[PDB]
């Protein structure tokens, strides 16, 4: 509460997008990186040709403390531990679909729940993320899955589905980065899977930092559906 | 004894993100026919204590460079990673084979890949006086294909990564102008499981699918 | 594996429902108790007038070990820790609804998601149960709730909703025990809440115990929708 | 100072299942008008360490018998629990006032209510030689109303429980034929919060709503 006066009183660093050589450090998941980085870098080529971006996984060593010190500029995801002293803003929702190769011998769109339970699955653990709750949702709902393969993260899902008859449960923003490159298609998901709301987070200290405010607004501009 | 066509065993496999995307598609494709009822689970070597989980049988096999797996462990060479330079096929200026000059002039995406053979690349380029405009640094490889497709960035990447991304993301590669060492990729198992028939069978499958011995 | 021969070889205790004075010990949640005990006791009055029933909460001190020793006869719920050595059978599903008093000034059926977010809520923590996951589901989906009151368990929900304009998110099997007694009504739930599949569990040791088999079949008979 | 009509404070309240169903409906009804923006959270006293959580301010008030809350704690009597016998209104044979004879002949649902004032009832009846056919034993009170409505069982229950269930579940009560002691229900707070204006205001509300001092 007390430092909110010294936060306001301190003179704010100038930010000129055309000239800045600032490094911004951004926390996101492997899904965030996959989805957000290509359009973000594409926008930046034209808007801020000289800044540097560095990313990091949230689940790696005091995000809250690093955002408090200015070491990490922004974070995207659920991040329930970011409370007092943090602003947040909803950007968009993950909507879950079923993904499988284009010429799968039997998979249909719209897939039935019965077929979903007959087919073989790849699972992604995605520990401590919103995606990591999906397995429990399905189990608690008594929806059987033949879990042929389980991997910890998302990198190999495109290539795996391309080469096999496995099906996957993925956010639509993941599917979008995979469908054309890997010859994949999707179906609306037969199970009752709720959306995951993805937020942008910043520390109160950087609420009126011009560079921070500039990058945040670019994220809203590019990705907001809220 | 072990029966692949009837086995219901779960095999747990330690590999990096590159190993997962390179190894798992052909492995799973082979297993569809050869062991239709087994289950596969994988994990990163930098998760739990790998040595202890292999000694105990929690992790069946490890794949990668893995220099700490010494006493108690067997290993077998599968192949080498060779570094290439990758960029989108209609890049405005990037050429193949690329010069060290163009390499140091263009803009890069870097992958940190902490505690991995790839994690050494930054340091090696630096110690060689090879300068790089690091436009984007990411900790792992997942987003590299899509990022290169949408930008004029270039990446330093194993050839085995590139082969999974070239056609999907419309990219091409060049031999790498720097003198980056090749990285040996080995198959590792604990001595306690040297003669487990399940473990032996899986190892043989990895050798059959991936060993470049001849070749 | 080895004791499965001594399990089969041992002579099984006779069970005559009309004469048995056996105590059966049953593990269930406060929702299970509320829902299952009234019809179960009603059936037993007519079927087995002399047995005793005792219940207990699963989340209290080595259910798995107590079922292994025969101290607890059956368990109902999710109970993910009951694996090797346990049979299970799906009985029915919890389906989630919104519950509020009959003459609530503004609550409608079917309630909108927007209204759901405008109204004030009572929440039940229900730690380590399927119901305890509902709060996280709603939060991760970015569905705002004004949490006016939070209680740990279900007992007071009927009386609370009767006396206030609070709304609650509850299984329909809970609502059914509350609607008429407390003057309450329900709406289909505006959020995308998946069902919770409730199973009956027994240890392999008692798979062919006639008294155990008799009680299990009564649970299937009375409650199965599977 | 403390402003009830503008406060945004969360108050955390320890009470048993009976206290929650008896206390919370009129409390929340009073708060609708008197403090529309505060939040209430409750918990069972047999969760965490209550003493430590009250000393630290994590738990604002406790309600019940709570004999361990001694040094460091203030308390104030709110009312007494009197035991009654409860059964469905058209029970085939149960009478009010019930005899000890009929009581020991009928079938019972018991509530264990571990580590609670009610937890003493079984032992007291036993030591008095009052026999009971314990047809059903449950650990807590939630299902008692519905169970009594659907069966010919009878229950020994605080009158404050009965008042919440009589009309909803179509039950009636009888004075209890046994000599069960009344149970004092107190309001407890830690000495550190004796003069917290928020805490004082809530305490006064509890006294206003529930104290039977006169009465």
């Amino acid at each position: 509460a007390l430092n909110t006066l010294q936060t306001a009183l301190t003179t704010r660093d100038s930010f000129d997008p055309f000239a800045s050589t600032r490094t911004f450090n951004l926390a996101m998941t492997d899904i965030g990186e996959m989805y957000l980085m290509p359009p973000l870098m594409e926008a930046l080529a034209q808007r801020a040709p000289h800044i540097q971006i560095s990313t990091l996984r949230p689940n790696a060593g005091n995000l809250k403390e690093d955002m408090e010190s200015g070491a990490v500029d922004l974070a995207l995801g659920l991040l329930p531990e970011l409370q007092t002293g943090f602003f947040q803003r909803r950007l968009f929702r993950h909507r879950y679909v079923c993904m499988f190769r284009k010429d799968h011998p039997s998979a249909k769109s719209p897939m039935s729940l019965k077929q979903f339970s007959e087919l073989e699955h790849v699972g992604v653990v995605a520990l401590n993320t919103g995606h990591g709750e999906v397995d429990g949702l399905l189990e608690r709902a008594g929806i059987k899955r033949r879990m042929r393969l389980v991997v910890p993260h998302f990198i190999a899902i495109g290539p795996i589905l391309h080469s096999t008859d496995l099906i996957a449960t993925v956010p639509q923003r993941f599917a979008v980065r995979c469908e054309v490159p890997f010859g994949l298609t999707t179906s609306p998901h037969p199970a009752k899977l709720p959306d995951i709301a993805i937020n942008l987070f910043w520390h109160a200290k950087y609420n009126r930092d011009p560079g921070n405010m500039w990058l945040r607004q670019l994220f809203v501009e590019l990705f907001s559906e809220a």
Side-chain angles (χ1 to χ4, degrees), chain A residues 134-143 145-204:
Chain A
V134 166
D135 187 53
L137 289 154
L138 292 171
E139 204 188 63
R140 290 188 309 269
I143 295 172
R145 282 188 310 159
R146 304 169 62 202
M147 303 298 306
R148 175 72 154 154
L149 173 60
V150 172
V151 293
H153 306 287
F154 282 91
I155 186 167
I157 299 301
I160 291 160
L161 295 189
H162 177 73
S163 289
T164 63
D165 292 341
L166 296 181
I167 70 172
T169 286
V170 298
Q172 192 156 47
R173 281 161 218 274
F174 187 77
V176 102
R177 294 276 171 276
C178 287
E179 273 187 279
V180 170
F182 294 100
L184 271 21
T185 192
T186 72
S187 161
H189 205 288
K192 283 199 269 186
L193 291 173
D195 300 341
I196 300 285
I198 302 288
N199 307 287
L200 179 64
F201 290 89
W202 62 104
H203 199 271

Side-chain angles (χ1 to χ4, degrees), chain A residues 8 13-58 60-61 63-101 103-143 145-152:
Chain A
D13 284 55
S14 286
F15 185 83
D16 175 0
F18 289 2
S20 188
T21 48
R22 192 174 158 167
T23 308
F24 293 93
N25 304 281
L26 317 168
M28 57 195 75
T29 63
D30 74 339
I31 293 275
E33 204 162 85
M34 168 73 114
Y35 175 71
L36 298 169
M37 297 311 302
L40 176 68
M41 296 312 296
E42 194 179 31
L44 297 178
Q46 311 301 334
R47 300 204 198 198
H50 311 288
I51 70 168
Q52 301 177 269
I53 308 295
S54 186
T55 73
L56 50 330
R57 293 294 164 271
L63 183 53
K64 182 149 80 182
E65 185 192 323
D66 294 334
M67 299 186 68
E68 292 169 350
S69 58
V72 171
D73 296 272
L74 301 166
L76 296 98
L78 291 171
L79 314 166
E81 289 286 281
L82 305 183
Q83 292 306 333
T84 285
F86 284 88
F87 292 68
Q88 62 187 83
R89 159 161 198 154
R90 217 185 291 317
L91 250 28
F92 55 80
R93 293 161 92 66
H94 291 164
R95 303 171 178 82
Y96 276 84
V97 297
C98 195
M99 197 164 67
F100 45 89
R101 69 191 177 85
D103 299 307
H104 197 282
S106 51
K108 304 145 172 53
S109 178
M111 184 176 292
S112 69
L113 225 219
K114 184 193 187 226
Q115 187 175 46
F116 183 83
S117 295
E118 277 163 9
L119 266 10
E120 293 180 292
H121 301 254
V122 211
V124 9
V125 174
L127 188 72
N128 298 317
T129 69
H131 182 86
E133 298 296 325
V134 166
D135 187 53
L137 289 154
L138 292 171
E139 204 188 63
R140 290 188 309 269
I143 295 172
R145 282 188 310 159
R146 304 169 62 202
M147 303 298 306
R148 175 72 154 154
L149 173 60
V150 172
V151 293

